[PDB]
Amino acid sequence: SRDTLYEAVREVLHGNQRKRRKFLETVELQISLKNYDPQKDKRFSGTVRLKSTPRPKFSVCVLGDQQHCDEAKAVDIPHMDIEALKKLNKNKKLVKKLAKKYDAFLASESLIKQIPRILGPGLNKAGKFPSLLTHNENMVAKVDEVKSTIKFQMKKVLCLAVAVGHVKMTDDELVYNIHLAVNFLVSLLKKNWQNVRALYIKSTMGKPQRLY
């Protein structure tokens, strides 16, 4: 459990061969896992926290019958109170497509009378649990929830992928994200000696190329 040292961890400005598109790209962190069983009780999962979150692209489900409902319509999202929940019945799961369609949900003062129910755990470790600490109020912080925290999980492919960088925000805001990302990964890393094989570099879309 020893991957480390920040003497020469710099000069990440070279992104001409990777990024030549019009829009802004997502530089991701991936790793190759070894000595891990996919099906049994071996579970590698956790919540890595960043301070300055660059740009996670994901959709947010918004529900409410208050001023939040009136102010969330300026985001130009298809917001709808009860017919949107009526559209998502128990038929879109019988249909083979995934009946989730949202990576985030709402937990605010409109649904605070409906939230204290028996429904507890779920996709909290997957990272689909709204809370008041991470700004899921959605009248002003709906735009700010585009910049949200990150999390990671495992599946049967036996690989890891998380979004830690974006070459809008400069690399001075991303280097501290790299510091905190590896600082939480070493702390959150059963007995497993040196799981870190090779940290990957990643952009939005493309072809393979080796650089550490």
Partner: protein, 50 residues
């Protein structure tokens, strides 16, 4: 020292620590030598990368 580098390549940390301890002496010297060999192993890995 090249044998200790080969033990670092085949990743046997406990046997490498015991071997470096048997060669140089005390455990403080062995722990410092293991970290110095890991640092130059990372330097050689960076040199083999570019």
């Amino acid at each position: 020292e090249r044998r200790a580098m080969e033990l670092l390549k085949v990743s046997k940390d406990k046997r490498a620590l015991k071997f470096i301890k048997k060669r140089v002496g005390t455990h403080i010297r062995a722990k410092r030598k293991r970290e110095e060999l890991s640092s130059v192993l990372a330097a050689m890995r960076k040199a083999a990368a570019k």
